[PDB]
Design a protein around this ligand. Structure first.
Ligand SMILES: Cc1onc(-c2ccccc2)c1C(=O)N[C@H](C(=O)O)[C@@H]1N[C@@H](C(=O)O)C(C)(C)S1
Ligand SMILES: [Zn+2]
Ligand SMILES: [Zn+2]
Length: 241
């Protein structure tokens, strides 16, 4: 088993599949986890989501690489055997967007914040094929998110990056904070190299307010947590200003 240097460990409830780990969170929601082996440091886990919506599946975030992302698609084919309608990626960094080419080879429509698509080439990423735009209060413009089923996309403001977005899963008590939110026991806010240290706290809190009844908070580098992950992230971010 994979014991990452950074990221949650495997526990009861986890399925190893290839180089990845999958965990069912709800009857129709699974967390995908993939690992980047960094030289001299060991594996860094990154999480995203798989959502069944009737006869189709929706994905939030790629794995770190194209091969890992193809493995996600193979797990979905094995375990669910329904087509992937679209994927939403939550900002233009490798943990979230490093597998875009596997999605595109598979014929899956991809969506990202317009700003993530504008940044991606500068980051050595491939842009998603469609751009999401957002209102002044952070809610996605619904015409840019056609047929998203239960995915409710919200741009909370700059934080981990200027383009980070978040996704609520309607019909469940789950919301996904991506790299913006760290868990309730975290000692750090992770990589702040692209962060907006003035606005981070307010953006973390805005994500909480967008999904006020979400009780299970999913994030990129820890196991799903309570709402304390939001409040503790904001308290850590208050110290950056
Ligand atoms: C590693 C890693 O190695 N190379 C890239 C990369 C490639 C192209 C563009 C940008 C980065 C990368 C990456 O994606 N790093 C992310 C980042 O910087 O935010 C990861 N999220 C952090 C967080 O959530 O705090 C983290 C400390 C877990 S690291
Ligand atoms: Zn990032
Ligand atoms: Zn990250």
């Amino acid at each position: 088993e994979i014991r990452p240097t950074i990221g949650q460990q495997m526990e009861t409830g986890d399925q190893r599949f290839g180089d990845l780990v999958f965990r069912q969170l709800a009857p129709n929601v699974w967390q995908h986890t993939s690992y980047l082996d960094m030289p001299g440091f060991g594996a860094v886990a990154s999480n995203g989501l798989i959502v069944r919506d009737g006869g189709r599946v929706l994905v939030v975030d790629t794995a770190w690489t194209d091969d890992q992302t193809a493995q996600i698609l193979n797990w979905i084919k094995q375990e669910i055997n329904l087509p992937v309608a679209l994927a939403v990626v939550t900002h233009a960094h490798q943990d979230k967007m490093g597998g875009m080419d596997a999605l595109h080879a598979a014929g899956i429509a991809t969506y990202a914040n317009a700003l993530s698509n504008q940044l991606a080439p500068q980051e050595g990423m491939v842009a998603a094929q469609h751009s999401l735009t957002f209102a002044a209060n952070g809610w996605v413009e619904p015409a840019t998110a056609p047929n998203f089923g239960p995915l409710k996309v919200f741009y909370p403001g700059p934080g981990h990056t200027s383009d980070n977005i978040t996704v609520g899963i309607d019909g469940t008590d789950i919301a996904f904070g991506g790299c913006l939110i760290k868990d309730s026991k975290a000692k750090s806010l992770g990589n702040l190299g692209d962060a907006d240290t003035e606005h981070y706290a307010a953006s973390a809190r805005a994500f909480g307010a967008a999904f006020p009844k979400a009780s299970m908070i999913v994030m990129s580098h820890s196991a799903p947590d309570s709402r304390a992950a939001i409040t503790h992230t904001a308290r850590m971010a208050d110290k950056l200003r």
